[PDB]
Amino acid sequence: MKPVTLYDVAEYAGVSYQTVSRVVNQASHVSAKTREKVEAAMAELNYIPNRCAQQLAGKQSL
Amino acid sequence: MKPVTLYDVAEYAGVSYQTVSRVVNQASHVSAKTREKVEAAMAELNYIPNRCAQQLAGKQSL
DNA sequence: GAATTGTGAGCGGATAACAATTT
DNA sequence: AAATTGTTATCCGCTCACAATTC
């Protein structure tokens, strides 16, 4: 109930939603500054991956 | 687990993914000929209808 | 015109690459 | 050149629309 998208995390962090995909997967081209902000945002919004959209798009991850 | 998609069923029945979805949904534009072929094909590969994808495809609502 | 069947695009989301800027 | 950040395009099982064919 009331999930959190990777979009919410980006919006709060003040970065592009792709910046999250980066920290989540391609840590490359991701400075510690931005990385730390995204990681912290995951707790702020209480990031709960879109079980429907993620499983669909190709990111079930258990 | 093998997440069989409507494409896998359509490929087995020799139909379209739209046809498969029409059979799974049981709404309109579906003939009994293809319906019984899709229900049979989805039984071979053990197709699991994704309700999450359905919610998304039909515009994720609250 | 509607139904049937197939193809294309979108839903809302994510992933990857490219261009520009900084170091 | 490499790293960093933002942006565009494509992909995902499913649904809708469009196109073609048949009724």
Coordinates of C-alpha atoms (C1' of nucleotides) in Angstrom, one line a residue:
Chain A
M1 CA 0.0 0.0 0.0
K2 CA 1.3 3.4 -1.0
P3 CA 4.6 2.4 -2.8
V4 CA 7.4 4.7 -3.8
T5 CA 8.8 5.0 -7.3
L6 CA 12.4 5.5 -8.3
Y7 CA 11.0 8.7 -9.7
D8 CA 10.1 9.9 -6.2
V9 CA 13.6 9.2 -5.0
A10 CA 15.1 11.3 -7.9
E11 CA 12.6 14.1 -7.4
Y12 CA 13.5 14.4 -3.7
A13 CA 17.2 14.0 -4.3
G14 CA 17.0 16.8 -6.9
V15 CA 18.5 14.6 -9.6
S16 CA 17.2 13.0 -12.8
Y17 CA 15.3 9.7 -12.4
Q18 CA 18.1 8.3 -14.5
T19 CA 20.6 9.4 -11.9
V20 CA 18.9 6.8 -9.6
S21 CA 19.2 4.1 -12.3
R22 CA 22.9 4.9 -12.2
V23 CA 23.4 4.6 -8.4
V24 CA 21.2 1.5 -8.5
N25 CA 23.1 -0.2 -11.4
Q26 CA 25.9 1.7 -13.1
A27 CA 27.8 3.3 -10.2
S28 CA 30.0 4.7 -12.9
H29 CA 29.8 8.5 -13.7
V30 CA 28.2 8.8 -10.2
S31 CA 30.1 10.9 -7.7
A32 CA 29.9 10.1 -4.0
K33 CA 28.0 13.4 -3.5
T34 CA 25.1 12.4 -5.8
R35 CA 25.3 8.7 -4.7
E36 CA 24.9 9.6 -1.0
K37 CA 21.9 11.9 -1.7
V38 CA 20.1 9.2 -3.7
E39 CA 20.8 6.6 -1.1
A40 CA 19.5 8.9 1.7
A41 CA 16.4 9.7 -0.4
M42 CA 15.6 6.0 -0.5
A43 CA 15.0 6.3 3.3
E44 CA 13.3 9.7 3.2
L45 CA 10.5 8.6 0.8
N46 CA 10.8 5.0 2.0
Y47 CA 11.5 3.7 -1.5
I48 CA 9.4 0.7 -2.2
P49 CA 10.0 -0.4 -5.9
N50 CA 7.0 -0.5 -8.2
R51 CA 6.3 -4.2 -8.0
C52 CA 4.2 -3.9 -11.2
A53 CA 6.2 -1.5 -13.3
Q54 CA 9.6 -2.8 -12.3
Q55 CA 8.8 -6.5 -12.7
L56 CA 7.4 -5.5 -16.1
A57 CA 10.2 -3.2 -17.3
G58 CA 12.8 -5.8 -16.3
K59 CA 13.8 -5.3 -12.7
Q60 CA 12.0 -7.8 -10.4
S61 CA 15.1 -8.3 -8.1
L62 CA 13.5 -10.9 -5.9
Chain B
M1 CA 10.0 -19.7 -12.0
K2 CA 9.3 -19.1 -15.7
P3 CA 7.3 -15.9 -16.1
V4 CA 5.4 -16.8 -19.3
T5 CA 4.2 -13.8 -21.2
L6 CA 1.4 -13.3 -23.7
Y7 CA 4.1 -13.4 -26.4
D8 CA 5.1 -16.9 -25.4
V9 CA 1.5 -18.1 -25.6
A10 CA 0.9 -16.2 -28.9
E11 CA 4.1 -17.9 -30.2
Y12 CA 2.9 -21.4 -29.2
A13 CA -0.7 -20.9 -30.5
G14 CA 0.5 -19.1 -33.6
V15 CA -1.6 -16.1 -32.8
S16 CA -1.0 -12.5 -31.8
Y17 CA -0.2 -11.3 -28.2
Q18 CA -3.4 -9.2 -28.6
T19 CA -5.4 -12.4 -29.3
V20 CA -3.9 -14.0 -26.2
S21 CA -4.7 -11.0 -24.0
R22 CA -8.2 -10.9 -25.5
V23 CA -8.6 -14.6 -24.4
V24 CA -7.2 -14.0 -20.9
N25 CA -9.5 -10.9 -20.5
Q26 CA -12.5 -12.5 -22.2
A27 CA -14.0 -9.2 -23.4
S28 CA -14.4 -8.5 -27.2
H29 CA -12.8 -9.2 -30.6
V30 CA -12.3 -12.8 -29.5
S31 CA -13.4 -15.9 -31.5
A32 CA -13.9 -19.3 -29.9
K33 CA -11.4 -20.7 -32.4
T34 CA -8.5 -18.6 -31.0
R35 CA -9.8 -18.6 -27.4
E36 CA -9.5 -22.4 -27.1
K37 CA -6.1 -22.3 -28.8
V38 CA -4.7 -19.7 -26.5
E39 CA -6.1 -21.4 -23.3
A40 CA -4.5 -24.6 -24.5
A41 CA -1.2 -22.9 -25.4
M42 CA -1.0 -21.1 -22.0
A43 CA -1.5 -24.5 -20.4
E44 CA 1.5 -26.0 -22.1
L45 CA 4.0 -23.3 -21.2
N46 CA 2.1 -22.6 -17.9
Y47 CA 1.3 -19.0 -18.6
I48 CA 0.7 -16.7 -15.7
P49 CA -1.5 -13.6 -16.4
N50 CA 0.2 -10.5 -14.9
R51 CA -2.3 -8.5 -13.0
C52 CA 0.3 -5.9 -12.2
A53 CA 1.1 -5.3 -15.8
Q54 CA -2.7 -5.2 -16.4
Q55 CA -3.0 -2.4 -13.8
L56 CA -0.2 -0.6 -15.5
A57 CA -1.4 -1.1 -19.1
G58 CA -4.9 0.0 -18.0
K59 CA -3.3 3.1 -16.4
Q60 CA -2.2 2.6 -12.8
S61 CA -5.0 3.8 -10.6
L62 CA -5.3 4.1 -6.8
Chain C
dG1 C1' -19.8 -0.8 -38.8
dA2 C1' -18.4 -4.6 -35.8
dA3 C1' -15.8 -8.6 -35.0
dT4 C1' -11.5 -11.0 -35.7
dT5 C1' -6.4 -10.8 -35.9
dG6 C1' -2.2 -8.5 -36.1
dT7 C1' 0.8 -4.6 -35.4
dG8 C1' 2.1 -0.4 -33.1
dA9 C1' 2.1 2.5 -29.2
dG10 C1' 1.3 3.6 -24.4
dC11 C1' 1.1 2.8 -19.2
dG12 C1' 4.9 4.3 -15.5
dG13 C1' 9.1 2.6 -14.8
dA14 C1' 14.2 1.5 -15.8
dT15 C1' 18.4 1.0 -18.4
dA16 C1' 22.0 2.4 -21.6
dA17 C1' 24.4 5.8 -24.5
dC18 C1' 25.5 10.5 -26.1
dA19 C1' 27.0 15.4 -25.5
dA20 C1' 28.7 18.9 -22.7
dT21 C1' 31.4 20.5 -18.8
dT22 C1' 34.6 19.9 -15.2
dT23 C1' 39.0 18.0 -13.5
Chain D
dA1 C1' 40.5 11.2 -21.6
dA2 C1' 37.7 10.2 -17.6
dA3 C1' 34.1 11.3 -14.6
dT4 C1' 29.7 13.5 -13.9
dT5 C1' 24.5 14.7 -15.0
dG6 C1' 20.8 15.4 -17.8
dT7 C1' 18.1 13.9 -21.8
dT8 C1' 16.0 10.6 -25.6
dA9 C1' 14.7 6.3 -27.2
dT10 C1' 13.6 1.6 -26.5
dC11 C1' 11.8 -2.3 -23.8
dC12 C1' 8.3 -4.7 -20.6
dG13 C1' 3.5 -7.9 -20.1
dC14 C1' -0.7 -5.8 -20.8
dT15 C1' -4.5 -2.7 -22.9
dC16 C1' -6.1 0.4 -26.5
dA17 C1' -6.2 2.1 -31.1
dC18 C1' -5.5 1.5 -36.0
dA19 C1' -5.4 -1.3 -40.3
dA20 C1' -7.1 -5.1 -43.0
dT21 C1' -10.4 -8.7 -43.9
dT22 C1' -14.7 -11.0 -43.3
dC23 C1' -19.4 -10.9 -41.9

